[PDB]
Symmetry: C3
Subunit: 341 residues, 3 copies
């Protein structure tokens, strides 16, 4: 019910789209997503203007999406280009709503709000996903929880030990200086852990000069729910730029009030020509989502009714600064938008 | 919530009933339908007056339906004929509601509204279903959509050109000529496809024949939601009257606000003793009706919340006259009834 | 929505609890139930004070329940005993709600209401369950009906003549004699079946029986929804006291407004060292209690919307005295509680 509609959201990964329409709901809005013959992606409201049939169940006819019910045909902009009935007249009432869409950084971005306010330049920067110097692997996941629970999750390092123990684990609670930098529509949480233990994968690409001052775990948040992290390791006192690292794409898109779409990916600068490494990284990310984070957040969503019926508020700990700030920024965006409705 | 209760609806096909009660909900009213030992069908509110147990889960005892909970027995009129407890007294408070019911034309009709207005003069004529000159085959289907969506569907048979493409597509669709006749309590939509190649289905009716043909697809609607179509095909310019045809029964009965019962059938005057022709008609009913149409209308029902939340209204085409008129007649019946209670 | 929270309810059977937490909802309240290393049972609100994760999905760490999300640890009283984050401070806001709990008579009792009013001395007496002179076997069942429908069911044991026809029908039902004893927070219904043929079940307990049989079916109800019955059968003219019997535990605990937990058991004074009798009772509990009654009450729950929408009230028979009285006592408790906010 309460979404920030005036913002860019990822609706799909390029590989998911083709001439066969994909029906997907974004912010309670049903969409028909498909790639036209010229290769350009189109996004139409998945509701035919005639009698409301799902356009996503149709097929392309001469490059145009044909409604599966009575045959009306539409172009990528939503204009009805063919009416096979009667005099074949095509009044403006037959056009279907079209959404601004941009394919960039191996992501399909969509603006579900006021179309007059959609500026391609305000789209988050995920350039690493299409940089020849990086190898990117990823996927899609559906989760039955409000998207804000997963934003909280991604902005927090404290559950790694208990939720992702299979991968991330430690035994130190005396050393932890994470700085949170608040910008405009952007927030970064930087963490540098000297003497940090490199991953099993990034270790294979290290020669030898371990010295307490060489491990990073950072994350950047952009307007609403798009995040990119930075997991890295270095020899000694070398800068972040010259380290072995992976930039992780973690973008959430609300489906309904209690469900969301999760687009994940890893863009690494090591083992670039290792095909079996691709399967590995993609599976661990999938595991971290499906088999672990999903279980936790879906259980929390199931407790929302009780917490709201009663007046229960969360008790924050020292590790919640970044999440709390992002949570507050999203709230402000919800209010700023409602102050127009 | 909004149903036209003062009208006759089909609650079951004769073959579905026996001494074993059938529990079925009609217009949000749970019914217990069964055939008494004398062969007469009975319809009782499926709620025992004592503690509300489902009478439909009981069995007949000496021709009377016995409640499975504490044994009260009832006759076809809903009168409690036996109370096995205490002095065995049977006060009027123990009688269960009974609904007017009429078995006619191989259909079981029921009046769910004001029993004092049960006007049998209003039972639609489906005589072809029991005419020895016709062969009838049919079935039952349950659909998760408001019944009005299927009424719309059946009054626009032209959708077959797209929804039933593989069997009904016709190269002469663009030469279609339709008219609409409005009479006393009845609306008819006539369609004619002249001098074209028979569709895949029509070919089977003519036993794999080619050569130009004239087609007719007419449909009659009667008060609320009972329809009978006319599908005919014949060579060149032969008389519509002396043509090979099938009269299709298509009757809808609301179950809940968002679900309905669909009773379909085909009464043909050709291939009367041909088992393979029976198979062709049954294949068509299972594929087109039970599958194809269901997919479309159920997807539309899922889009109702969005269309209502926003102020979206349908855009009518030249082929919608008949459906729009029936839709308006049903609306008037809803208002005339609401102005009563 | 309307529950009598100020009363003791059974939340589990001792055998269901261990160091692995059991998540269960009682009166719309999610609980985490577990046995601490010292063997004492604990009951905490299954919602972590930090971010609301289910504590029931956690494990015990050094005798304390650890939240599976970020590691907070709690003691049986709900006090946070360990915070692994930052300075490890533990403000009062980190404690979780704990519920008064008492393990007695092989039952786990919990007080879901005002903790200040919980008095262990008001817990129903089910001593037979731990008396060395009796052999007790039982189990748990979940039912999708408001708990009051099952209380009604248990207070009218006469339904067994029809609902459990195959197992308990007696040909002397017509000569039954009832008595009802009313007390403070207690109501008893007595039934006597004089000189009849033993039912299939009673014959199983007796291991034969030629001569006529006297059967007793008594049941005691205590404040809210805890019942204990008395099933006895004897030959020719043996008195009820000095005889062979089983004391049946039948306790219901509301889960939601339309669902409940059913704890059943049989404590017999015959065949104490007989495995075959154990099977007979478990077979009965599985068939009659978990299958047969469930079908009836769940069907009734499905008819509640219709009966309420219309103004339908139940018509009582001569066998409803006990049930009606308990129903009235429960209503009074609901009102007395609603009158104090
Ligand atoms: C849906 O109406 C029909 C059409 Cl348009 C073509 C062929 C048949 Cl068999 C029917 C039928 O009555 O089922
Ligand atoms: C449901 O109460 C019973 C009746 Cl009515 C007959 C026999 C038995 Cl064993 C029980 C029981 O305690 O489950
Ligand atoms: S609903 Fe799309 S053309 Fe009719
Ligand atoms: S509920 Fe039908 S006789 Fe009791
Ligand atoms: S939700 Fe329990 S420790 Fe964070
Ligand atoms: Co074009
Ligand atoms: Co996580
Ligand atoms: Co009779
Ligand atoms: Co159709
Ligand atoms: Co301790
Ligand atoms: Co510590
Ligand atoms: Co029973």
């Amino acid at each position: 019910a309460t979404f920030v509609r005036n913002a860019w959201y990822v609706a799909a990964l390029p590989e998911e789209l083709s001439e066969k329409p994909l029906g997907r709901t974004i912010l309670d809005t049903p969409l028909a997503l498909y790639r036209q013959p010229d290769g350009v992606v189109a996004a139409l409201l998945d509701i035919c203007p005639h009698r409301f049939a799902p356009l996503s169940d149709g097929i392309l006819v001469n490059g145009h999406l044909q409604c599966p019910y009575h045959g009306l045909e539409f172009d990528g902009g939503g204009q009805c280009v063919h009416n096979p009935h009667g005099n074949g007249a095509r009044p403006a009432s037959l056009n279907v709503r079209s959404f601004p869409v941009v394919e960039r950084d191996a992501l399909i971005w969509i603006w579900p709000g006021d179309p007059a306010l959609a500026d391609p330049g305000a789209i988050p920067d995920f350039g690493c996903r299409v940089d020849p110097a990086y190898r990117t692997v990823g996927g899609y996941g559906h989760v039955d929880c409000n998207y804000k629970l997963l934003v909280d999750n991604l902005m927090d390092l404290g559950h790694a030990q208990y939720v992702h123990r299979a991968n991330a684990q430690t035994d130190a609670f005396d050393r932890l200086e994470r700085e949170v930098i608040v910008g405009d529509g952007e927030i970064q949480a930087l963490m540098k852990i000297p003497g940090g233990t490199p991953s099993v994968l990034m270790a294979k690409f290290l020669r030898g000069a371990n010295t307490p001052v060489d491990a990073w775990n950072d994350i950047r948040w952009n307007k609403v729910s798009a995040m990119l992290n930075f997991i890295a390791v270095a020899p000694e006192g070398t800068p972040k730029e010259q380290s072995i690292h992976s930039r992780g794409t973690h973008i959430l898109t609300p489906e309904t009030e209690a469900s969301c779409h999760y687009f994940f990916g890893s863009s690494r600068n090591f083992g670039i020509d290792d095909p079996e490494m691709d399967g590995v990284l993609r599976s661990w990310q999938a595991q971290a989502l499906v088999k672990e984070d999903k279980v936790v957040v879906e259980a929390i969503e199931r407790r929302r009714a009780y917490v709201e019926a009663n007046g229960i508020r969360p008790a924050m700990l020292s590790c919640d600064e970044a999440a709390v700030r992002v949570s507050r920024e999203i709230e402000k965006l919800e209010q700023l938008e409602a102050a127009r409705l």
